[PDB]
Subunit: 533 residues, 3 copies
């Protein structure tokens, strides 16, 4: 096999040029398809052209930043020095302008919108004040992250809610997800037959969770998920001044669950501080995963609001975490170590899909069993309370009634009107004691009732509430924060960092409370920008 | 935060009084609700008053025993010394009176009831004699536990079967369980839709198992389960004279499965003797769990008889275990170590519920798969036997026919009449080779046939049997003793005590046989007290 | 208990004779039943007589070989020496006769059958040549296994396809399996109700997998599976000259999956060579398991062809493995060590059934989830391609179209006609990127369409293809070779042999390719013997 040896030697000699040429040919073929499509018809091929353009722009941008990082940093340095020199007096001017802007916005927009929006702003202040009073180290508070996190939420809300471009963008983004979740019906129909709709939740909704988990694993293998995570984490790190580890985890928890987001930084967990560990747990409790997003949309919950809430939950989580548990130690991990995220042990795309599918088995099983147990307990509790309430000739006592009268102040501070605050309080109670699947199920019921158009009151009982209240409830309920999740979060994090078991347990409860506050903070910002129809 | 530090110092200074006062206020509030309910109406609030009274009585009782244990023991000592002094002659009088009482009961009650009850008593003697002949150490038999265990069963049967108070109490207790298992329909309806009744067993019965497992975990967290276990174990220990470890496990196996009852004593397993290890396995094989109780009731099996059999199975298990495998060593574990039972790692009630729910996944999955395999094998075996039986012009040969002609003597000794003994033998065969889900399914069929009222014989084949025979079959089938369970029992116990693998394997088969004998012993006692309608 | 001690002493003294006599009595009873059945009627009892006769023959044969092995080997030795002496010249005569026979068969049978059969023979040559060119060590090729493996396939095909006895035998064997898979309906009906047919695949097909897995475990406990494996492995070892380890694994992969066949040789995995490890993986990828056989038959795929393909896949796997990755080291494991296969830790038959049932849980769960994900991805890909294809006014672009135009040459070489080659290529694509459940589902659709008798072309689109093409597709698709299975195969084999992780990864890709080639080789042989109707 002398010829074979010569071929092997030739391949070894010019390995780099051979593969580079092959990739170049593939790129040229793709560009040829794009240009030909535009030539035949442009209006029909516009989205393909747009996707190609943005991809080219980002690839060129990333290459330039990597290659010319030193030159750009040196070029920026003189301006930074000048700003540092004049900052001692310029800080008052900047702060005064920002305060004036906030005042003007309240006077000319919030007051015009109505009283409820002002109450939302007041609740935002009150929640922040309460977090300060009950802080771990009230004296040792670094206020830069708190203000920046709130400001970033306010800017995101303005761009996505009060501007036609952002409103259109997220409405389009939500509609694509709604289209994407319909593909799972093909697999559900075969496995469970054409009668799979006889059992809606089990045979139609859970397959959506399976399909999304598969896609998320495929994206992780390709590396797009990390690409977005790094881009977002840099913004939060630069503006807020947080540690790289917590910034990366917060950015990654937008798309990933509480139990799989810390895996983005596994080696460095033993060396993190208590504050960073608290922030990690807080971020997990203040967000949802991309696998369960489709199920909530299938119920009837707005896709745009869910996406907006998930994005806004990261800066709030870090801001509340820093205020609730500030940093009193020296961080050890650096930016390069945090940003590098180890992809899984998948040789090819299809193997990644199988791994994602297999992981979804325990996910759906636990979801189904937990729902069965919780609803069974709820029915038992309601029957028992009715039995106890009949002694005083009040047989209507129920878990809902107690929660409505208990969690009412929390909803009123978020800007919900007096009548609907009692209805939102029930959803808050469902989320706090059970999981958020129950709360969104009840919320979907109310949304459907309103869309039907039936009477708003029957026998003196309110049947549905306003559209604005539904939006606020959507933001407040977007989280994995429940008393039950405390144990599994602790167990998983100890399994990843056995040496830090003592520290993990200490901050878990504070993190669980911080996550709920962060969700409420997002709801307050949504409430003060939405209008009363 | 000087004020915060002062508040923290104040809380630390009087931590004990602060929490005690809070608990006192809660207790006062509960009492205020109870008294107010009684004032408004007494007949309507009676059960709440009763529950409060018994709870107060037990709390006071437990506190007094804990505080005044030494004084009470010293007060009792003189009487014990006097009894010991006169016991050498007083033992004959007591034994003679007990023998005379047994004779009188047989003559004036059993003979009046009929021949079958006398046969039940004879079978009770015969089973005990057979256990003695095939004992491990026939010479080294301690007869106190054997007689006390049988006597306790006889007293329990008299109080629960032949007295209006006990009969009413357990009928009421069974009805509450029947009400309790209906709450799972709320969760089943949502997960599996309103058509969940199209698939009865999978979508309605298994959720009952999930719900009960959840409740059992919640009770274990609160500590009620241990409270009852200690109370029962003390009675068996004091009367029978068994070791604390086996007494606790036997009392706990009334409510818990064979594989989770030994966890009540995990640390001390390596130090137990062979006899105690045999008793532990025997108790597991002679009882059922509280999670599968609802499924059996859903089939149609009597709730009262199931509860009565579960209670009566513990003294029988210990009695047969001691006789079959008596003690020839010195026990090491003491009472205080055995009674202390380590609760699970659950921070709150809701976390306990989630843990109980998660554990039920493997339970229902194994149940469903095992049933599919066993019934498929049963159909294959019956077809093969019919194929083989046709050679001799007898195509009716089947697994049922062989079992009916094989296990008939065991049922006749339990007091079943000649005609129905062949029908009970089939159920015994189903339980021995398959699990007890199959046997109870067949028993429910027969119960439904009788309740319908159709012909008792069609084409010369008996369709159903008497009510008394159904009760006896209910007692005999209440156990986890099957050839398949031998492996999983050994594996789980080795996993808990790796060093004792050699001892565990040796006694597993004897324990499996002892459990079946104990179940038969309970059935014999039930048969000799029930009447022929 | 002096009598008991005497009985124990008597049992110990003559333990061997006591159990031997008991077994003899049981054998005599069985023979009495057989003879009596024949006496009453012979034609009705014929199959029982046949089974008894063959069992007796094999038992006697095995005993004689074990006892008289040395004498037989010595008796054969002189002939072997004489053949070795004259082999230097006799080899040319034997080889020439074999070549002449092949030529005569082609001229007088293949040419008569038609052109397509000749193309199948050409494809067989071409696939072998390609494996030679891309071999790991082309110079160090041992050609004995390659020719013997192909020859054994040719002989098996002749006996099973072109002879009435073999054709009848495998048709009968397939029909028995079809009867055997109907027994699972008994368990499915109870667990999932009488409406279990509303969801065909989940509630009827998967239980078949559960039932077969249970039966396979029971057979493994009894030892029949090993008995057949040794008999087949000896034939392949003697004729082909392969190592005992790979021969045993190849014979065992006919009945067992890729992940459980290596367990037949667990201790010796660290000591195998690279070539043997490659052969093990190749055999796993070139065969299916007996648990999934029923599901494929339920779809509508021929049982006889599936059995024939599974048998023919072992010699092909070894032949291709040796050619693709020949041996350049010295094997260490011997025949006695390889043949001894350690049965599982099952005390009795029923425990084995439970263990087999439990293992099937993960099997069916992974199957269902993988199918849901793959079909969902397929729908998404097709929609995306249609969206991209509309730019060029070609909205019919799809995964099927691309695969049809890509994998066409592979199907044409196997002997499929021009029109049907494009249809077979789609099935090949489904098997390569997804699993073989999808491909067989599509194949069953085509088979049903043909059996209906509808038009073969509608709107110029072929709806179904010939019966011969369906057979060829059946042979080509019989394998577990897919890109996704690569990871799980590597993980399982590393878990069994941790030290060989580096070697396992290197040969996995070559093994995956070899398995597909082996499946194609079987299809080519089937194509050249089947006739065009
Ligand atoms: C419209 C809805 C949302 C708009 C959000 C807009 C958010 C921007 C709002 C306001 C931007 C201006 C805020 C500047 C505050 C100074 C922070 C600082 O660094 O010094 C700290 C004083 O920190 C304090 O104690 C100040 C707390 C009260 C300030 C209220 C204003 C002390 O130094 P540091 O601890 O090292 O830090
Ligand atoms: C129009 C609608 C209504 C108004 C909405 C306004 C929304 C404003 C949203 C976000 C602005 C948030 C400002 C928070 C300032 C934190 C103060 C601090 O100590 O950090 C300082 C950062 O230096 C700065 O002051 C940052 C200035 C950013 C200007 C934003 C435009 C210095 O950091 P440090 O020395 O490390 O300490
Ligand atoms: C009505 C239905 C159920 C009623 C149950 C009523 C049960 C109560 C029945 C009977 C109560 C009286 C039993 C007393 C028997 C003596 C036991 C004893 O301690 O000495 C043992 C003799 O042990 C023996 O060998 C006696 C065995 C035969 C006795 C039959 C009576 C020897 O000493 P030990 O080994 O150290 O003990
Ligand atoms: C009315 C219906 C029909 C009659 C039903 C009767 C039901 C009777 C049910 C239970 C009574 C069971 C009696 C078993 C006696 C065991 C003998 C023994 O050696 O242990 C002795 C216990 O000392 C005793 O004898 C216990 C006396 C208990 C009296 C019960 C009233 C001494 O123990 P040891 O020295 O450690 O040895
Ligand atoms: C009908 C459909 C299927 C029929 C299958 C029939 C199969 C039987 C077909 C043919 C049987 C005769 C084959 C004998 C070939 C010699 C093999 C040998 O041992 O020497 C080798 C030469 O090896 C070679 O290079 C020969 C390759 C070309 C031979 C084509 C004929 C070298 O020695 P080795 O490496 O130590 O070995
Ligand atoms: C009728 C239909 C058409 C014809 C179909 C024919 C189907 C033929 C099918 C199978 C025959 C395959 C023959 C392959 C021979 C391999 C050559 C080799 O080196 O090994 C030699 C084996 O010694 C042999 O030659 C084996 C002879 C077997 C004769 C079969 C009858 C010596 O081994 P080595 O010294 O260790 O090297
Ligand atoms: C959660 C993860 C992803 C959810 C994000 C949405 C991804 C799916 C959108 C694409 C879609 O459904 O339309 C398809 C185009 O699909 C593509 O062109 C995507 C190319 C890659 C065609 O559907 P159409 O637009 O109805 O025509
Ligand atoms: N991808 C994940 O990690 C995930 N998804 C769902 N849940 C759990 O399911 C519950 C309800 O959806 C949540 O509270 C979580 O505890 N976890
Ligand atoms: N809670 C438990 O431990 C449990 N419950 C059921 N089973 C098993 O399920 C089988 C039939 O119910 C029993 O024989 C047991 O082996 N075990
Ligand atoms: N018994 C087994 O080992 C088995 N059975 C099925 N599969 C997997 O299921 C997939 C489709 O059946 C195959 O590719 C295998 O990867 N494995
Ligand atoms: Na999240
Ligand atoms: Na949130
Ligand atoms: Na039990
Ligand atoms: Na029992
Ligand atoms: Na196989
Ligand atoms: Na194959």
């Amino acid at each position: 096999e002398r010829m074979c040896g010569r071929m092997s030697d030739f391949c070894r000699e010019h390995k780099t040029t051979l593969r580079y040429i092959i990739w170049g040919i593939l790129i040229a073929g793709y560009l040829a398809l794009v240009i030909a499509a535009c030539v035949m018809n442009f209006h029909r091929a516009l989205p393909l052209f747009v996707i190609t353009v943005v991809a080219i722009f980002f690839v060129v941008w990333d290459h330039l930043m990597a290659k010319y990082e030193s030159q750009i940093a040196r070029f920026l340095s003189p301006g930074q020095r000048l700003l540092d020199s004049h900052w001692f007096w310029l800080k008052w001017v900047i702060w005064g302008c920002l305060i004036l802007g906030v005042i003007l916005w309240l006077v000319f927009d919030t007051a015009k919108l109505g009283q409820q929006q002002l109450v939302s702003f007041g609740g935002l202040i009150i929640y922040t004040s309460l977090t300060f009073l009950f802080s771990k180290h009230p004296t040792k508070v670094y206020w830069r992250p708190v203000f920046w996190g709130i400001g970033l939420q306010f800017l995101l809300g303005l761009l996505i809610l009060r501007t036609e471009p952002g409103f259109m963008a997220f409405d389009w983004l939500g509609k694509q997800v709604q289209t994407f979740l319909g593909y799972s019906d093909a697999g559900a129909s075969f496995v469970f037959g054409e009668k799979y709709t006889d059992h809606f939740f089990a045979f139609k909704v859970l397959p959506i969770v399976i399909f999304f988990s598969t896609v998320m694993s495929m994206l992780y293998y390709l590396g797009l998920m990390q690409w977005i995570i790094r881009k977002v984490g840099w913004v939060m790190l630069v503006t807020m001044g947080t540690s790289p580890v917590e910034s990366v985890v917060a950015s990654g928890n937008i798309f990933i669950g509480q139990t799989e987001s810390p895996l983005l930084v596994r080696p460095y967990l033993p060396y993190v501080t208590k504050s960073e560990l608290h922030a990690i747990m807080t971020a997990g409790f203040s967000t949802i995963a991309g696998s369960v997003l489709g199920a909530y949309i299938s119920f009837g919950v707005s896709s745009s609001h869910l996406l907006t809430a998930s994005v806004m939950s990261a800066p709030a989580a870090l801001a509340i975490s820093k205020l609730f548990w500030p940093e009193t130690e020296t961080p050890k991990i650096n930016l390069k170590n945090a940003m590098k995220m180890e992809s899984g042990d998948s040789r090819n795309l299809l193997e990644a899909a199988t791994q994602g599918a297999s992981s979804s088995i325990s996910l759906v099983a636990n979801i189904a069993v937990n729902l069965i147990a919780f609803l069974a307990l709820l029915s038992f509790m309601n029957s028992a309370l009715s039995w106890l309430g009949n002694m005083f000739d009040y047989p209507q006592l129920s878990f809902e009634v107690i929660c409505s009268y208990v969690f009412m102040p929390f909803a009123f501070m978020m800007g919900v009107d007096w009548q609907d605050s009692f209805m939102v309080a029930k959803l808050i109670g469902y989320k706090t004691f059970f999981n958020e699947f129950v709360a969104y199920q009840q919320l979907s019921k109310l949304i459907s009732l309103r869309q039907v158009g039936g009477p708003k009151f029957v026998d003196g009982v309110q049947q549905y509430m306003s559209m604005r209240s539904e939006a606020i409830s959507t933001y407040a309920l977007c989280g994995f924060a429940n008393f039950g999740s405390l144990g599994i979060v602790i167990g998983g994090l100890t399994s990843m960092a056995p040496s830090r078991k003592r520290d993990i347990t200490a901050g878990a409860m504070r993190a669980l409370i911080a996550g709920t506050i962060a969700c409420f903070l997002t709801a307050c910002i949504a409430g003060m920008l939405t209008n009363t129809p």
